[PDB]
Structure formats: structure tokens, C-alpha cells
Curated annotation (Swiss-Prot):
Disulfide bonds: C1-C15, C5-C17, C10-C22
Upper taxonomic lineage: Eukaryota, Viridiplantae, Streptophyta, Embryophyta, Tracheophyta
Function: Probably participates in a plant defense mechanism. Has antibiotic activity. Has a diuretic effect. Has a uterotonic effect in humans. Active against the Gram-positive S.aureus with a minimum inhibition concentration of approximately 0.2 microM. Relatively ineffective against Gram-negative bacteria such as E.coli and P.aeruginosa. Inhibitory effect on the growth and development of larvae from H.punctigera. The unmodified form has hemolytic activity, the oxidized form lacks hemolytic activity. If the protein is linearized, hemolytic activity is lost.
Protein name per the record: Kalata-B1
Tissue: Leaves and stems. Lower in roots.
Post-translational modification: Kalata-B1 is a cyclic peptide which occurs in three forms: with unmodified Trp-19, with Trp-19 oxidized to form oxindolylalanine and with Trp-19 oxidized to form N-formylkynurenine. Oxidation is enhanced by exposure to sunlight.
Gene: OAK1
Source organism: Oldenlandia affinis
UniProt family annotation: Belongs to the cyclotide family. Moebius subfamily.
Domain notes: The presence of a 'disulfide through disulfide knot' structurally defines this protein as a knottin.
Length: 29
């Protein structure tokens, strides 16, 4: 997702929080 969820939040739709980065379908993209 190229996103971080340091604050336990992700903007990218479908990206799950996996501190400190947002993961997508099982992998941070």
C-alpha cells in the first residue's frame, strides 16, 4: 500500500493495519 498505520489507521481501501505499515491481501504493498 506504501502506507503506514503507525496510528492504527489506513487510508488505502483494502489495506489492513500491521503496525507500523498497512498490508494488502497479506503483504505490504
Amino acid at each position: 500500500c506504501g502506507e503506514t498505520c503507525v496510528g492504527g489507521t489506513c487510508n488505502t481501501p483494502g489495506c489492513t493495519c500491521s503496525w507500523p505499515v498497512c498490508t494488502r491481501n497479506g503483504l505490504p504493498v
